[PDB]
Design a protein around this ligand. Structure first.
Ligand SMILES: *CCC(=O)N1CCCc2cc(C(=O)OC)ccc21
Length: 292
C-alpha cells in the first residue's frame, strides 16, 4: 500500500515502534496526510480491526487496517510529534505545570474511554503519546499488545522499555487489569514534572528494585497475594518507602495525592481513570497552547 504507484506515497520516516516502522504518507486518492505503520495471524487481524470503532478525541484515530501481501498496515491520523520529543525540546525549562495538568487530564479521558470499552493498552510510554499544536494529546497503539504480545526487543532489535511497566506484570501475574495503564501513566506524569524518568530500569530485576527503593518493598499488608506471585522471591531486599515529597518536587499536594494513588502496588487499590478525572488536582484544569 505504500509506494510510487500505491494508494500511499511516502513523505518521510516518523519513527520505529515495537512492531514496525511508521512513515508520514500521503494518500493519492483523498489528499489526506497520514501516519502509516508497516508491520511485517488471523486472531490479531480480527482484534485490531475492532479498534476502528474505538474513537475518542484523546485516542489517535485509526483510519484503516490493511492486510496485504503478508503485511499488516495501520493507517492513523497524523499529529505534530510525540511526547518524548516534546519533553526533550522542553528540557531546559520543563513543560509548564498547567500544560502537564491538561495533558494528564486528557490522557485520563482517553484511558477512561478505552477501559469502559474493555480495551487496555499495556505498553504506554511517551513515544506513543502524540501532541498537536493546539494543546491536545492522544494515545496511540491501544489494543496492539493484546493482539501481538509485548516482545523483549523490537523488529529492529531495540530494547522495549521496561520503565513504565506495572509491578504485577514484572512479578509474573497471569491476569492484567486496566490498572496496568494507570501505573504507566503515573510514571509518565512524574517524568513530565521532574524531567527525569521515575524508574529507569535496565532489566526486569533493576526495574523491580527501582520501584521497591522508592515505594518500599511490597508485602502482604499493602498488597494481598504478593508473596504468592510467580516471580516473587522471599529473598528480595526490604527497602523503606520514600515520601512523595522527595519523589516529585515541586508538585503540589493534590498532584502528589493523585500520583500516590496511581502508584498503589495492589491493582485493586489503584485509582481508576474515571476516578482520577474527578480528583481535586483537576479542579482548575485549563487547555493551554504548547510553546513549539
Ligand atoms: C498508525 C500510526 C501509529 O501506529 N502510530 C504509533 C506511534 C507513532 C505514530 C506517530 C503519529 C504521528 O502523528 O506523528 C506525528 C501517528 C500515529 C502513530
Amino acid at each position: 500500500p505504500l509506494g510510487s504507484m500505491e494508494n500511499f506515497q511516502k513523505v518521510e520516516k516518523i519513527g520505529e515502534g515495537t512492531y514496525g516502522v511508521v512513515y508520514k504518507a500521503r494518500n493519492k486518492l483523498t489528499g489526506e496526510v497520514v501516519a502509516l505503520k508497516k508491520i511485517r495471524p488471523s486472531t490479531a487481524i480480527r482484534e485490531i480491526s475492532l479498534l476502528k470503532e474505538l474513537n475518542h478525541p484523546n485516542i489517535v484515530k485509526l483510519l484503516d487496517v490493511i492486510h496485504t501481501e503478508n503485511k499488516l498496515y495501520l493507517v492513523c491520523e497524523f499529529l505534530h510529534q510525540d511526547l518524548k520529543k516534546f519533553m526533550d525540546a522542553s528540557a531546559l525549562t520543563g513543560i509548564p505545570l498547567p500544560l502537564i495538568k491538561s495533558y494528564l487530564f486528557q490522557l485520563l479521558q482517553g484511558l477512561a474511554f478505552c477501559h469502559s470499552h474493555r480495551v487496555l493498552h499495556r505498553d504506554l510510554k511517551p513515544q506513543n503519546l502524540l501532541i498537536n499544536t493546539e494543546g491536545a494529546i492522544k494515545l496511540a497503539d491501544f489494543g496492539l499488545a493484546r493482539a501481538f504480545g509485548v516482545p523483549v526487543r523490537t523488529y529492529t532489535h531495540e530494547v522495549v522499555t521496561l520503565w513504565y511497566r506495572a509491578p504485577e506484570i514484572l512479578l509474573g501475574a497471569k491476569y492484567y487489569s486496566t490498572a496496568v495503564d494507570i501505573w504507566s501513566l503515573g510514571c509518565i506524569f512524574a517524568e513530565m514534572v521532574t524531567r527525569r524518568a521515575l524508574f529507569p530500569g535496565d532489566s526486569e530485576i533493576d526495574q523491580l528494585f527501582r520501584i521497591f527503593r522508592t515505594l518500599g518493598t511490597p508485602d502482604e499488608v499493602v498488597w494481598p497475594g504478593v508473596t504468592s506471585m510467580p516471580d516473587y522471591k522471599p529473598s528480595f531486599p526490604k527497602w523503606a518507602r520514600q515520601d512523595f515529597s522527595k519523589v516529585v518536587p515541586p508538585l503540589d499536594e493534590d498532584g502528589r495525592s493523585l500520583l500516590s494513588q496511581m502508584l498503589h502496588y495492589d491493582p485493586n487499590k489503584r485509582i481508576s481513570a474515571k476516578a482520577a478525572l474527578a480528583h481535586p488536582f483537576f479542579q482548575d484544569v485549563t487547555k493551554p497552547v504548547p510553546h513549539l
